[PDB]
Design a protein around this ligand. Structure first.
Ligand SMILES: [Zn+2]
Length: 125
RNA sequence: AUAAACCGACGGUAUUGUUCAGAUCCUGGCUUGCCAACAGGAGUUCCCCGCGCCAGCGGGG
């Protein structure tokens, strides 16, 4: 990578593309190895999205309707439905799959990271 | 001056040892190459040297 790639692409990043970077790292990226875990699907899951003429239409096409949403995710439950940052994960915890809310699952991040304090105005790398 | 630029897939290695292709076998029998025929007209025989020259005679190669 150091040999073949352009440097300074991670020098400075906008809030948007850092949110995107974070979500991507949480979902489709395989890092960081070591004492770091990926989830919930696993390492390098493949995403399949229906596409439309427009972004709006695309996002809406990939949304689950309320009855089917309820069907795929049986709310039964003892299910906590708060995100990783709202209600944190407990270390070494044994979490049953069915106990995860459809909210907690979609925005699940096991990375356990904080964004350092921002800086001023400039071009995003 | 291009997903470009700068840019080895690299180093190490017997395919080795043993082994008759052997024994039997006539290519045999029959066939004219025959018919015709002056070699004679011609003195050119290429190079030098000596002596002759209506002639030619010699000496070398
Ligand atoms: Zn940016």
């Amino acid at each position: 990578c150091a040999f073949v790639n352009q440097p300074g692409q991670g020098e400075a990043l906008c809030g948007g593309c850092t949110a995107i970077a974070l979500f991507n790292q949480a979902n489709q990226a395989p890092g960081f190895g070591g004492g770091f875990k990926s989830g919930l699907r696993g390492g390098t899951p493949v995403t399949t999205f229906v596409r439309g003429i427009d972004l709006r239409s695309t996002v809406l096409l990939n949304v689950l309707t309320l009855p089917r949403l309820q069907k795929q995710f049986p709310n039964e439950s003892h299910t906590e439905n708060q995100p990783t940052w709202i209600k944190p994960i407990k270390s070494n915890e044994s979490i049953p799959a069915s106990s995860i809310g459809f909210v907690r699952g979609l925005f699940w991040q096991p990375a356990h990271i904080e964004l350092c304090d921002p800086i001023g105005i400039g071009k995003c790398s």
